[PDB]
Amino acid sequence: NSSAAVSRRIASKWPRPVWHAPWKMYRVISGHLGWVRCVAVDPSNEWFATGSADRTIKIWDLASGQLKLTLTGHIEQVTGLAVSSRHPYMFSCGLDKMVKCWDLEQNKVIRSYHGHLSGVYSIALHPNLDVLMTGGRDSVVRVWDMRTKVQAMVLSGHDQTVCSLLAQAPDPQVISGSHDSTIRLWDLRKGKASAVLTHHKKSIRALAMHPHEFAFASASAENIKKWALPDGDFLHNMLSQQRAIINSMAINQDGVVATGGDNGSLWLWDWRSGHCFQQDETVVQPGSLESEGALYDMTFDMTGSRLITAEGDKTVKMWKEVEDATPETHPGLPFRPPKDIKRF
Amino acid sequence: WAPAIGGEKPSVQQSAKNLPGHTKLKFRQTGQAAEEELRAKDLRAELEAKERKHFGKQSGTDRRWDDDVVFKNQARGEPKQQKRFVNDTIRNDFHRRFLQRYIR
Amino acid sequence: PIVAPVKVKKFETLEAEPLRTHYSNEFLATLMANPELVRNVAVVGHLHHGKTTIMDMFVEQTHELRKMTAAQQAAGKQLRFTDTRLDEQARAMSIKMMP
RNA sequence: GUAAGAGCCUAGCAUUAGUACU
RNA sequence: CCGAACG
RNA sequence: UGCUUCGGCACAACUGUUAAAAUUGGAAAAAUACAGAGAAGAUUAGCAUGGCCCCUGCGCAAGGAUGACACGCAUAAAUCGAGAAAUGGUU
Ligand SMILES: Nc1nc2c(ncn2[C@@H]2O[C@H](COP(=O)(O)OP(=O)(O)OP(=O)(O)O)[C@@H](O)[C@H]2O)c(=O)[nH]1
Ligand SMILES: [Mg+2]
Ligand SMILES: [Mg+2]
Ligand SMILES: [Mg+2]
Ligand SMILES: [Mg+2]
Ligand SMILES: [Mg+2]
Ligand SMILES: [Mg+2]
């Protein structure tokens, strides 16, 4: 219609925020010797893996936070981690240009996916095919046969580092976000972008799918946008700006969107209304700089009740819902609908 | 300043690392968190169970020879050292111990 | 392992269905229900003096296991029916009595 | 003193298509 | 035990 | 060659990148002569980066002067408006 017309529609009909209980940080785990950069939860929900700038992958007990195992095989930072839901496999990528399949029955690297020309930044397992997708500084999403280690496909078109990656079973089966400020939705059968989304002004460092809805969120240093699938229809911006580079985004089944800032902020938003009900800043562990405070990864556990964050003060932090909270004792940041008339 | 971009008869040069290996995939069986096995359970029950177990079962509750000597009691007052993580490159304890060990 | 392999717990691996015999199930069910056609016998001897093999010859004459025998003389070993535990097997020794 | 290349002359690898008259 | 290339 | 009513049937079925050539062109090398080596004073170890540069190598090694090149020599005008003053037209 217009920006004015749509702004009046928006003042009338914006979905109100669903009340979400606040989250509190209940656990710091020290022990990585570099920035914790990636997290991944195992589908059983009993351990998580964190990769680091100290080049290791640590396996942690999800309920005690206990170091179960350290895995060394990367030469540089571990930048991405993906635990398979269908295979007893963990996948890691790293700044060493290397993608590794870890056999979790051996605790050993059994396959290596060779071919990234620069450091690898993002990883994604196809949820239904035995295929993995990695993006890196060579601006390219490399699509790998899990079994034969073969590079089945190269998704070309981005211009800078592919920083975020999504994989789903419906079309578009790969979503990438890049430092070139675009999101490509890919047709995995054709090897071609099915859509290029140019609404972001900064680089898209975080993508997240909605667990249940056909929609994803992308996050920049400037906005978190929400997009409808298959075609990547812009739904909306979050109703506030985390004034931070967002490194990580996780979405819950309750629709809690967690976004984690390069400055160590953690904002919790209502998916579906776009409204942030919580805003936190990290505390950095003793010794750290407060410059060294970013929030590089976050995942929810499989139930959605825990959020594990991988931080630049080299900690894993764990957050649980203060779910003994009720919309009366704990509403959080309160909502004013987007009443403005603005230009879009 | 700018990396190489990595876009994609076939060449018949065969690498050694590209010879067949691990030619079948392991799948998660019944007992290794397989997807059909995991819909069946309440993972929140097991998580809150394990967290309560950990958090409670870590809490554990439901004149002499030394008369000319000029200094007495000089160890008393010394700090007993602690298992702590300092996020400092050079001011952590591994490093202080390392430099103590290797520099004489 | 971080994902424990779901292992065949190789203790003593038997076969997955009652085998073919020269009699039925109900025939033995009959011959059991009357004391005057049942003899209980333990077989004993020295070490190796032929006990396991005699029991095996009985099995060989009253059952259906010929291609088993072909697998035995192709693999190069003679059968040991009552020596079932594959660790009592690989010592050519009966370790625990079996009925 | 490396040893690189530019060129000059002379300098033996690949190819099987094409040749008309108001 | 045991030898070749390269730098 | 069988079978043959000796008339004939049956069977068997399309090689050749067609050259002992003809051109035809492009090539590495050799000599010659040219000229003849990173970094900041000098002398020197390298490891990179980028790609219509390759060579040696089985190479996802390693090497080739850190293999070379590039590498800036920025005669890359990165360039212009503010105001007073003063002078010019017109009344
Ligand atoms: N020459 C000969 N050897 C035999 C005969 N029967 C069995 N054997 C051999 O004797 C070996 C030992 O006999 P087993 O079948 O082990 O009988 P066993 O005496 O119960 O031995 P244990 O199992 O140790 O008690 C076998 O492996 C055969 O090679 C036979 O009639 N003649
Ligand atoms: Mg070297
Ligand atoms: Mg050298
Ligand atoms: Mg080098
Ligand atoms: Mg080299
Ligand atoms: Mg040298
Ligand atoms: Mg070089």
Choose the residue to mutate in C43, C49, C52 for probing ligand 1, maximizing ligand atoms within 8 Å of C-beta. C52
CA distance C15 to C57: 19
Q: List the one residue out of A344, A336, A99, A130 whose CA is nearest residue A234.
A: A344
Give CA separation, C42 vs A192, C45, C98, in Å.
77, 10, 10
Q: List the one residue out of B39, B58, B46, B44 whose CA is nearest residue A321.
A: B44
A149 touches strand F (CB under 7 A): yes
Q: Do A263 and A293 form a contact (C-beta atoms < 8 A)? A: yes
- The angstrom resolution of this structure is 2.6
Spatial neighbors of A268 by CB under 8 A, at least 6 apart, are: A20, A22, A23, A256, A257, A258, A276, A277, A278, A279, A280, A332
Matching residue, tokens 């978190």: A224
Q: List the one residue out of A97, A190, A86, A105 whose CA is nearest residue A146.
A: A86
Q: Which amino acid is at B17?
A: K
- Quote helix, strand, coil % in chain B, to nearest 5: 25, 0, 75
Spatial neighbors of C95 by CB under 8 A, at least 6 apart, are: C83, C85, C87, C88
Tokens of C22: 């020269």
Tokens of A210: 């909605």
Tokens of B32: 């290794």
Q: Which residues of A121-151 are buried (b: 16+ CB within 10 A; e: fewer)?
A: bbbbbbeebbbbbbbbbbbbbbbbbbeebeb
Tokens of A122: 């993002």
Length of chain B: 104
Number of C-beta neighbours around residue A184 at 10 A: 25
Ligand 1, atom 17, residue with closest C-alpha: C50
CA distance A114 to A150: 8
Indicate the DSSP class of residue C91: T
Matching residue, tokens 């076939």: B10
Residue B44 contacts A, CB cutoff 8 Å:
yes
Q: Do A70 and A57 form a contact (C-beta atoms < 8 A)? A: yes
DSSP string, B15-53: -STTS--S-S-----TTTT-HHHHTTS-HHHHHHHHHHH
Contacts 24+ apart (CB under 8 A), C80-87: C80/C52, C80/C53, C80/C56, C81/C52, C81/C55, C81/C56, C82/C52, C82/C55, C82/C56, C83/C52, C84/C12, C84/C14, C85/C11, C85/C12, C86/C10, C86/C12, C86/C13, C87/C12
Q: Do B85 and A286 form a contact (C-beta atoms < 8 A)? A: yes
Residue B27 contacts C, CB cutoff 8 Å:
no
Q: Which residues of B47-78 are buried (b: 16+ CB within 10 A; e: fewer)?
A: beebbeeeeeeeeeeeeeeeeeeeeeeeeeee
Can you give the C-alpha Rg of chain A in angstroms?
19
- Solved using: cryo-EM
A148 touches strand F (CB under 7 A): no
B17 touches strand F (CB under 7 A): yes
Give CA separation, A130 vs A148, A340, B24, B39, B60, in Å.
10, 48, 11, 21, 46
Backbone angles phi, psi at B46, to 5 degrees: -70, -35
Query: What is the SS3 assignment for chain A?
Result: CCHHHHHHHHHHHCCCCCCCCCEEEEEEECCCCCCEEEEEECCCCCEEEEEECCCEEEEEECCCCCEEEEEECCCCCEEEEEECCCCCEEEEEECCCCEEEEECCCCEEEEEECCCCCCEEEEEECCCCCEEEEEECCCCEEEEECCCCCEEEEECCCCCCEEEEEECCCCCCEEEEECCCCEEEEECCCCEEEEEECCCCCCCCEEEECCCCCEEEEECCCCEEEEECCCCEEEEECCCCCCCCEEEEEECCCCEEEEEECCCEEEEEECCCCCEEEEEECCCCCCCCCCCCCEEEEEECCCCCEEEEEECCCCEEEEEECCCCCCCCCCCCCCCCCCCCCCC
CA distance A133 to A125: 6
Asked whether the bond before A230 is cis by omega within 30 degrees of 0, the reply is yes
Give CA separation, A274 vs A219, A250, A251, B59, C63, in Å.
13, 14, 12, 40, 76
Q: CA-based angle A38:A40:A41, to the nearest 5?
A: 155
Tokens of A249: 């985004």
Bridge partner residues of A198 (DSSP): none
Q: List the one residue out of A20, A29, A3 whose CA is nearest residue A313.
A: A29
B82 touches strand F (CB under 7 A): no
Indicate the DSSP class of residue C80: -
- Give the number of C-alpha atoms closer than 13 A to the C-alpha of residue A171, restricted to the C-beta side: 10
Burial (CB < 10 A; 0-12, 13-18, 19+), residue C25, is: exposed
Q: Which amino acid is at B89?
A: T
Q: CA-based angle A48:A50:A52, to the nearest 5?
A: 175
Give CA separation, A58 vs A284, A320, C55, C89, in Å.
20, 21, 57, 44
CA distance A8 to A88: 52
CA torsion angle for C29, C34, C36, C40 (degrees, to 10)?
Answer: 60
Chains touching A by CB (3 or more pairs below 8 Å): B, C
Give residue A65's region: left, alpha or beta (phi > 0; psi -120 to 50): left
Residue B38 contacts A, CB cutoff 8 Å:
yes
Choose the residue to mutate in C53, C55, C60, C97 for probing ligand 1, maximizing ligand atoms within 8 Å of C-beta. C53
Asked whether the bond before A172 is cis by omega within 30 degrees of 0, the reply is yes
Q: Which amino acid is at A266?
A: L
3-state SS class at C71: helix
Bridge partner residues of A236 (DSSP): A226
Q: Do A207 and A165 form a contact (C-beta atoms < 8 A)? A: yes
Q: List the one residue out of A103, A102, A107 whose CA is nearest residue A92.
A: A102
CA distance A163 to A206: 7
**Interface touch A286/B86, C-beta < 8 Å:** yes
**Interface touch C6/B30, C-beta < 8 Å:** yes
Instruction: List all nucleotides in chain F with at least one atom under 7 A from a protein Cβ.
Output: 49-51, 58-60
CA distance B56 to C8: 36
Q: Which residues of A279-317 are buried (b: 16+ CB within 10 A; e: fewer)?
A: ebebbbbebbeeebbbbbbbbbbbbbbbbbbbbbbbbbb
Query: Is there a binding annotation on residue C49?
Result: no
Element (H, E) at C14: none
CA distance A282 to A290: 9
Length of chain A: 344
Q: Do A246 and A224 form a contact (C-beta atoms < 8 A)? A: yes
CA distance A56 to A116: 20
CA torsion angle for A241, A242, A244, A249 (degrees, to 10)?
Answer: -110
Distance A151 CA to F36 C1' (A): 46
Tokens of A284: 């950095």
CA distance A113 to B60: 48
Is the beta carbon of C47 within 6 A of some atom in ligand 1? yes
Q: Do A149 and B2 form a contact (C-beta atoms < 8 A)? A: no
3-state SS class at C48: coil
Length of chain C: 99
**Interface touch A85/B47, C-beta < 8 Å:** no
CA distance A326 to A310: 29
CA distance A273 to B73: 68
Indicate the DSSP class of residue C35: G
